[PDB]
Design an enzyme around this catalytic site. Structure first.
Site, PDB file in Angstrom:
ATOM      1  N   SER A   1      16.240  39.176  43.317  1.00  0.00           N
ATOM      2  CA  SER A   1      15.295  38.437  44.163  1.00  0.00           C
ATOM      3  C   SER A   1      15.338  36.916  43.831  1.00  0.00           C
ATOM      4  CB  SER A   1      13.881  39.000  43.964  1.00  0.00           C
ATOM      5  OG  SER A   1      13.038  38.509  44.994  1.00  0.00           O
TER       6      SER A   1
ATOM      7  N   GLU B   1      14.571  46.518  51.948  1.00  0.00           N
ATOM      8  CA  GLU B   1      14.156  45.233  51.406  1.00  0.00           C
ATOM      9  C   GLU B   1      12.770  44.769  51.871  1.00  0.00           C
ATOM     10  OE1 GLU B   1      15.559  43.535  49.144  1.00  0.00           O
ATOM     11  OE2 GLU B   1      17.616  44.309  49.007  1.00  0.00           O
TER      12      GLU B   1
ATOM     13  N   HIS C   1      12.358  46.750  47.539  1.00  0.00           N
ATOM     14  CA  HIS C   1      12.872  45.594  46.843  1.00  0.00           C
ATOM     15  C   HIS C   1      12.501  45.746  45.358  1.00  0.00           C
ATOM     16  CE1 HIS C   1      13.972  41.286  46.970  1.00  0.00           C
ATOM     17  NE2 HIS C   1      12.899  41.000  46.250  1.00  0.00           N
TER      18      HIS C   1
END
Ligand SMILES: *[C@@H]1O[C@H](CO[C@@H]2O[C@@H](C)[C@@H](O)[C@@H](O)[C@@H]2O)[C@@H](O)[C@H](O)[C@H]1NC(C)=O
Ligand SMILES: *[C@@H]1O[C@H](CO)[C@@H](O)[C@H](O)[C@H]1NC(C)=O
Lengths: 531, 536
Positions: free
Chosen positions: B203, B329, B442
């Protein structure tokens, strides 16, 4: 003098001719006049009813073809010649044809009325693919087809003027529909059951009769094959009609509306045809110079406005498209395409083609089209690019406008049936890359494969019989399904909820859902918003 | 010394350290935790670039994690494992510039490839001390030397008044760079090879790795890179100098400051750290998700131009990169701000809620671009189906923020000469506490890359354990050679490089590698080629 061939209609007596159909004889009354010849001072004017005649009018041969541009793209090629005039050209062309079973029907038979296509600039009811003997003999139908003025003769308009009000070719069609109401019973047809069917500009015409009140009392059901009144090519605004008409006038040396039109009327017919194509505003394909005009009369508003706001309860409609609506128009104007090679194009040629295929697109809209149709896994592949070019033209001009019309009609209360025709004739003369081109389902609907001498396969003959059945069942009942046949499957109505339509091919009907749903949302919802 | 474990005493540039022997399922590992690599960035040092740590006398105790950098703590779901596993697990402090090293026990005989982890958390949170980043498994099973550092986040690490001397911006990235230099100078003392350093992060961590790839001075500090669910390019990883200035000055006002830059910054430096944290979310320009207040700024210095310009015109020969995304995601971001979504129900939303969600998920979209998004993601066969609308909302957020930016980066890197490997992680942990509708959210591939399933006490399945080992193998093979494939094992299918021509990438799940082509190619053409042209 065979009494079966002698009919009396309001204008007088007619003598038809007995024709041979594979399974038996049929009666044909060809070349029946339904209007005063629209010649001289009548050029560009609404049609007037035919004056009565004395004696027996000979109705044994097709009359002349309305004056029109003749194709020369591929001289002598069956692929393009099958659509060219097969009788003498003349402005004296307002005649209709009637095929009936022999002997004539005992009880009132549903009537099918065919309206030919040809971009509003060509066509004739006398073409071999529109031969009504098969439907008359096999299905016992009464089939009618009329000539209507095309090109400048049928659609050149100076909106608001008295001498060239526009849409007279649609009024020719209407007058013929009026003639069927007043006369078809004499042939054994039922004026209480009239079904209009047409292809391309003919389908668009049928749609305009659906959208014009005075026409509504002249028929009960409609079939629109590969064409719609809404869409990018079937209509022009009053302003663009005026513009095209005055520009055409100048190109032929003419000349106030009255004076302009008076000078246009002195010009030989071929002079008008000679400059017909010079008035389009951009280099394009699937665009025609003189077409129906939103006059605020025949068409009270745009087809779009009328389909969105109309009430279509009690109307049944059958609509459909062929598998490759666009291919045919590509050899007609896009660099890189030809009927003689695979037409494998470059990405550069693809971007160029899009500007031609979607002529009114801004640079941004054009890029949106390119990005939506490019296959990002193989962005440079010539085969995908060629096929995508075809899809762009077919979706923009026919498929999406059809999906749009189908949805609005269903939502507005009409009973709708939809199809996609996917069988390529074994006898097709165009290259394989063109697939099932615009106009090639017609010979199957009319039943030509039933003619031994044509060399269609046995499967194609069975297929044609299936189609004739769907069309005539639809004419008879507003439902293409067999009333006494179980073991099918059934063709379900198209609805906005389920969006069901069927595939018409050699295999049994197969029901699919969503007619190019994602792509038509792009054309029907997003591009407009990119106003 | 004299009475403790001789194998835990090490000397680095700043002095002597004493590590701790940790137990890993298959044996012991050496851990050196809380090593200071910079002077505490406190007081007059707040907002300033980090300064190297001054040498200490005696033996520094490196047996426990140090403080976590001052940051906002998540309250969305109090006491919930799902959000708690990401929250600070040590005291919050501005004195937080420490790093950690895990190595085999005893320490490696010959120089071992080094993996340096850079945590994510939207540039406003995170810590190298979280359990999911535990380096003991990679150290023990693959013999890796693993390093992780804390770097400043939120205002402390990214508030900027571009051009100023007192808040130049990107200092959190400079914190990471200083740790990379610390590794160059000191890792050999632990048996690590400074000639073989691979950066990996997820990320914001992945975006960070990408910015080191795009920043010259960082290039000489590492050799290979792994970007998991994040990229330096994209809509959230950077802001223009103008936008940073705007946010910084608005934040200053919200806390009563101050004029000129010096005075404003001098006043901000007198504010309690918690007051800055308390107002950091108030400066975003629109109601949004997947947007963070203080992030890397295109300063013309650390970042010479926009990451976009830099990836389009950079030369990436001799660079090997591994990049990928998880299956879902966007789902994680929907419960943090889109009405209709919750971790407690199936989040079946209405079409109305979908349209509103799009404005929040694509906050920079004009009305026209937003409608383009809605039209593209709507399933026109079932335009009102709530399940499709919920899943499409998720895809919109994930594609816009992670998947398409990753596709874009993989493509430009490959075209510019880099050796690229791509993946999509599709396995949902059997231990996942988020609802099923969220799929593989995510951040949930991390526990597998680090080998947590190898820990018996965690309750992962036997299959997850074998799966974790496969992943650790891919990552360490890549760190060792720039190729995730096992030099030996011809049997297992191969993971081919990603190229603009074939666009191949692999699926990472319980089944053997499967090669696929085109990473959401059609949809990413919409985000990466069309939306930008809708620049009018
Ligand atoms: C799903 O939940 C959303 C958040 O609401 C909160 O969580 C739900 C589970 C309930 O406990 C509710 O009382 C809480 O306020 C709602 O906004 C959304 O409408 C919910 N969807 C449903 C249940 O249809
Ligand atoms: C195909 O034929 C046309 C006309 O002869 C030509 O212009 C084109 O370059 C040819 N090659 C292709 C595009 O396959």
């Amino acid at each position: 003098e065979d009494p079966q061939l002698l009919v009396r209609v309001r204008g007088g007596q007619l003598r038809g001719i007995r024709l041979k159909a594979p399974g038996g004889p049929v009666s044909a009354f060809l070349g029946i006049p339904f209007a005063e010849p629209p010649v001289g001072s009548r050029r560009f004017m609404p049609p007037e009813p035919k004056r009565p005649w004395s004696g027996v009018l000979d109705a044994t041969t097709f009359q002349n073809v309305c004056y029109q541009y003749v194709d020369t793209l591929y001289p002598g090629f069956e692929g393009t010649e099958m659509w060219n005039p097969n009788r003498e050209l003349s402005e004296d062309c307002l005649y209709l044809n009637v095929w009936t079973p022999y002997p004539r029907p005992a009880s009132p038979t549903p009537v099918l009325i065919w309206i030919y296509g040809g971009g509003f600039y060509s066509g004739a009811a006398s073409l071999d693919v529109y031969d009504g003997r098969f439907l008359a003999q096999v299905e016992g139908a009464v089939l009618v087809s009329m000539n209507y003025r095309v090109g400048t003769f049928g659609f050149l308009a100076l909106p608001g003027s008295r001498e060239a009000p526009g849409n007279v070719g649609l009024l020719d069609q209407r007058l013929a529909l009026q003639w069927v109401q007043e006369n078809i019973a004499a042939f054994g047809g039922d004026p209480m059951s009239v079904t209009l069917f047409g292809e391309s500009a003919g389908a668009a015409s049928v749609g305009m009769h659906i959208l014009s009140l005075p026409s509504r009392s002249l028929f009960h059901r409609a079939v629109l094959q590969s064409g719609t009144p809404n869409g990018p090519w079937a209509t022009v605004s009053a302003g663009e009609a005026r513009r095209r008409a005055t520009l055409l006038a100048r190109l032929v040396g003419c000349p106030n509306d009255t004076e302009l039109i008076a000078c246009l009327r002195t010009r030989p017919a071929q002079d008008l045809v000679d400059h017909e194509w010079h008035v389009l505003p951009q280099e394009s394909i699937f665009r025609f110079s003189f077409v129906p005009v939103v006059d605020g009369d025949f068409l009270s508003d745009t087809p779009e406005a009328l389909i969105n706001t109309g009430d279509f309860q009690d109307l049944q409609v059958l609509v459909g498209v062929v598998k490759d609506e666009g291919s045919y128009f590509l050899v007609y104007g896009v660099p890189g395409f030809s009927k003689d090679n695979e037409s494998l194009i470059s990405r550069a040629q693809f971007l160029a083609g899009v500007r031609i295929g979607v002529p009114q697109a801004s640079d941004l809209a054009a890029e949106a089209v390119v990005l939506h149709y490019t296959d990002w896994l193989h962005p440079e592949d010539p085969t995908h690019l060629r096929d995508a070019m075809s899809a762009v033209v077919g979706d923009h001009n026919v498929v999406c406008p059809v999906a749009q019309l189908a949805g609005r009609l269903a939502a507005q209360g009409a009973r709708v049936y939809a199809y996609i025709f996917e069988h390529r004739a074994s006898t097709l003369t165009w290259p394989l890359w063109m697939g099932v081109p615009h106009g090639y389902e017609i010979e199957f609907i009319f039943g030509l494969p039933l003619d031994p001498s044509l060399n269609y396969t046995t499967e194609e003959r069975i297929f044609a019989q299936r189609l004739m059945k769907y069309w005539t069942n639809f004419a008879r009942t507003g439902d293409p399904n067999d009333p006494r046949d179980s073991k099918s499957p059934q063709w379900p109505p198209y609805t906005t909820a389920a969006q069901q339509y069927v595939s018409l091919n050699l295999k049994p009907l197969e029901v699919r859902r969503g007619l190019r749903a994602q792509t038509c949302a792009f054309w029907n919802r997003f591009l407009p918003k990119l106003l």
